Amino acid sequence: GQVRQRYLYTDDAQQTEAHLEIREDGTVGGAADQSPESLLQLKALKPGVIQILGVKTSRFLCQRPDGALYGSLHFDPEACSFRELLLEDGYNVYQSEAHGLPLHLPGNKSPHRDPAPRGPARFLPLPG
Incomplete structure (x- = not known):
């Protein structure tokens, strides 16, 4: 089980049903439905550290x-x-260990202001 295939979906999308999708152009964002690009190969590097590679x-x-x-x-x-x-609550999240940067979808910076504080998006991986 070194590597597994699963779709990344967060409860935040509850307001607007959507799943994490990677564009061919290299851009990222949500999608109307589960798209092929929403499939990410979850790979384990070191205990506690993982990598994600889109199949599409x-x-x-x-x-x-x-x-x-x-x-x-x-x-x-x-x-x-x-x-x-x-989380024991049954929620999974990802954050960069390099600088402690939280993982979140782009376009979230809709507000004019840009506060330093930012909460990470809770993700619920689905079987690939």
């Missing part, structure tokens, strides 16, 4: 220092690695 785009989902998500052709553990936080 064959791009490695990595977060930039700014905290934005984007697919990349090359592998970078400093940004393509995340710490898995498993």
